[PDB]
Amino acid sequence: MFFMTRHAREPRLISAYLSDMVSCTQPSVMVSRITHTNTRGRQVDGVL
C-alpha cells in the first residue's frame, strides 16, 4: 500500500519497487527523427 511510509528506512526495497515499476509497461513503438537526448547522447525513455 505505502512504500515510502512503511519501508522508509530500507533504501533498497524502494529502488526495487521503482525498477519493477519502470520495467512493467510495454514500450511504445514509435521511431522519430528529433527526440530528447542527454549530454552524452543517450535518449530519455520515460517520465516520473
Binding site: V29, M30, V31, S32, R33, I34
Partner: peptide, 27 residues
C-alpha cells in the same frame, strides 16, 4: 518525422542458444 517499427524479426544462430547444439542443413 515519426514512424512505427513493424515486424521485429529474429534469427537463430545469432541468439546465443546455438552453442548447445550443432545445427546443420540437409536437403
Amino acid at each position: 518525422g515519426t514512424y512505427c517499427n513493424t515486424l521485429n524479426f529474429v534469427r537463430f544462430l545469432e541468439l546465443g542458444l546455438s552453442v548447445a547444439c550443432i545445427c546443420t542443413k540437409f536437403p
